[PDB]
């Protein structure tokens, strides 16, 4: 398997790991802060997904310093992972077009 496909797969697995770890850590960081809502694991996982995809509905979000640092890691991991898939798709099209041109 070519590099871009392997890297894409790896990025997906790493993203799932970041989502799970981020969910666990977000609850750890937010409980103890009066008013915080990102405090149970099921909704924290949902929050991690809508954060990684950059949707950000606003139904849930961190209010503490550490919860926000966790959020930044989730954001960057999501953007980087989806960006890498785009890059892999571009490489695929580039390779195919070269062929179609006889190269």
């Amino acid at each position: 398997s070519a590099l871009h496909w392997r890297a894409a797969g790896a990025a997906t697995v790493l993203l799932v790991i970041v989502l799970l770890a981020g969910s666990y850590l977000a609850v750890l960081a937010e409980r103890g802060a009066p008013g915080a809502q990102l405090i149970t694991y099921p909704r924290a996982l949902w929050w991690s997904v809508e954060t990684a995809t950059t949707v950000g509905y606003g139904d849930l979000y961190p209010v503490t310093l550490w919860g926000r640092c966790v959020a930044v890691v989730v954001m960057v991991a999501g953007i980087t992972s989806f960006g890498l898939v785009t890059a892999a798709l571009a490489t695929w099209f580039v390779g195919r077009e070269q062929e179609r041109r006889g190269h």
Epitope: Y24, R31, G32, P34, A36, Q37, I39, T40, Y41
Partner: antibody, heavy 118, light 108 residues
Framework: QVQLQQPGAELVKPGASVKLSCKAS????????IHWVKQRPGHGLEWIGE????????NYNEKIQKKATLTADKSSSTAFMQLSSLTSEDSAVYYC???????????WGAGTTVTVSS | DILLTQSPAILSVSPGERVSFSCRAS??????IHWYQQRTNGSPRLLIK???ESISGIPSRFSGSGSGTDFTLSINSVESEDIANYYC?????????FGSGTKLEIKR
Amino acid sequence: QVQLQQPGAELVKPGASVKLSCKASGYTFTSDWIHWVKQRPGHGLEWIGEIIPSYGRANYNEKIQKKATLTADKSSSTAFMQLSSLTSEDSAVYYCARERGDGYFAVWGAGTTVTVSS
Amino acid sequence: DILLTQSPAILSVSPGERVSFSCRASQSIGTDIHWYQQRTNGSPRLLIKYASESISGIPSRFSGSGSGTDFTLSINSVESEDIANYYCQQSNRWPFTFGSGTKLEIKR
């Protein structure tokens, strides 16, 4: 089988401290939190604090004077609540309860009756 | 912190009659409300979770409803064993808080 085991009672002289225990059995997850609740005779339930054994962090009710310090021993699956410098105001039943990180207390211990008297 | 108001503090019903306990939150908490039963000298016992979800082992007689700020715990056809104190508890925001409790009294 009993998921949370707590000693029946503890007599404490005013000013002294005591360490309550809560031995847990059954399924255990990294997402479990052990809570402590205080209930004076004839009164309601008051949340004291919580601790996550897998990490060891504890949080406390800010609305009340802090009398407790929570710890947990992973190898013995036991959670502890150290109550210090007690007065008769601290006399009550202290329950421990388990929450699977999803907001509700799935199960409660039988409670430890603490009496502060000379 | 979220204040949970349970009023009336005492509810008197006749045998076999349907009863409803009230729980009002100081602010909207979605369906993050749970109900517990505590008999004399007993420890609290979970009856309903997330406002209306059944717990295995609890009689079908028990049900819950509501969302937002107003919640209800209902018992269809009350019987002696239901005599106890009932508490609501929220988990929408930190810290978790408890309502002050409602006692069920039966007029036989």
